[PDB]
């Protein structure tokens, strides 16, 4: 994550650091418009999503090995509860 963030930052911000103020202002505007979208969506979403379940499974395999000596059995106490269906 550190390397990918750094390389994206370089190849966007430093390019934006190029000196052109007449129409290059529009160049930098478009550059940042792209960079923000990338660095949020394609740089966070899949990363974190793929990341969390790793820790989750590690917790499972490194603790439940010592905690689940077995499985219990569910209860979910019931009562009258509202439902709605339509055709």
């Amino acid at each position: 994550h550190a390397q990918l963030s750094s390389v994206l930052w370089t190849m966007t911000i430093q390019i934006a650091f190029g000196f052109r103020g007449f129409v290059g202002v529009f160049m930098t505007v478009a550059l940042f418009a792209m960079w923000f979208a990338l660095t949020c969506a394609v740089l966070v979403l899949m990363e974190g999503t793929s990341a969390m379940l790793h820790s989750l499974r590690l917790h499972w395999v490194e603790s439940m090995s010592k905690f689940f000596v077995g499985e219990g059995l569910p209860y979910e106490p019931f009562a009258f509860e509202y439902k709605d269906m339509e055709v």
Partner: protein
């Protein structure tokens, strides 16, 4: 509703809001020196004062930001 906001107006507002805080900090680190974006053997050198361009960049963002705010504030 003066103007339709469902046309991804929230996107314009948020991006415009985020497109000025960065301008502030880059202007600061241009005028100021942190040897991280203005001072280096390879740093492009127009002097540590190019904050004019970034200061200019804010207005175009803010125009659309406020214009979309006008239509979207009715939902709060």
């Amino acid at each position: 509703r003066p103007v339709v906001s469902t046309g991804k107006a929230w996107c314009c507002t948020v991006l415009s809001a985020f497109g000025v805080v960065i301008l502030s900090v880059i202007a600061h680190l241009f005028n100021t020196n942190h040897e991280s974006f203005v001072g280096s053997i390879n740093d492009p050198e127009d002097g540590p004062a190019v904050a004019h361009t970034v200061y200019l960049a804010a207005l175009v963002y803010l125009v659309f930001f406020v214009f979309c705010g006008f239509q979207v504030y009715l939902a709060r």
